[PDB]
Subunit: 111 residues, 2 copies
């Protein structure tokens, strides 16, 4: 599965992985955009962030849309978008080096 | 809003709150059951559990159904069931006194 480790971007792959970006930017916004009648499924098997210095947010659309969660510790997380777009946003404090994270996404259904 | 602090049970109110149960049981399973064409919406504004000793799990149906998350730290969490039932399960270690938690649920749509 194509692994994305850029700080954000619009993603159109039918499936892929978002994993930790290690550069200087402190706010990365990945927007997953599927064809019109499709949905996006997002899975996070295990997440363990420092909730004091960083977080991951799942947004049901473009930035500005309803938030589905701002999460820093959990596992077995499954999110489905209500439309064709979902955004994943990671944020950290400048002084803090990013923790490891891996987010899987799928077009739902697959084609 | 009717507050439930029993260790589990089947809940049929059109809206309510699940909050910390303080008795000896270590596994509480709340199953929210709405009328047939409805869904359940579950909201958790802030959650801060000791992920080493306890957790909250959201299940898209009766126990045995797909898990939507096993979460111990986050905020702004919004879950919608795919059918008429959703289960919330809390678990803790026997030695550990339960942390505060508050889970809101709504019939979606309201009637």
């Amino acid at each position: 599965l194509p692994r994305n480790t850029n700080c954000g971007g619009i993603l159109k792959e039918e499936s892929g992985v978002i994993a930790t970006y290690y550069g200087p930017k402190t706010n990365c916004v990945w927007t997953i955009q599927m064809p019109p009648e499709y949905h996006v499924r997002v899975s996070i098997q295990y997440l363990q962030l420092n909730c004091n210095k960083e977080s991951l947010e799942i947004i049901d659309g473009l930035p500005g849309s309803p938030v589905l969660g701002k999460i820093c510790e959990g596992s077995l997380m499954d999110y489905r978008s209500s439309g064709s777009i979902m955004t994943v946003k990671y944020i950290r404090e400048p002084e803090h080096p990013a923790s490891f994270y891996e987010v899987l996404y799928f077009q739902d259904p697959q084609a």
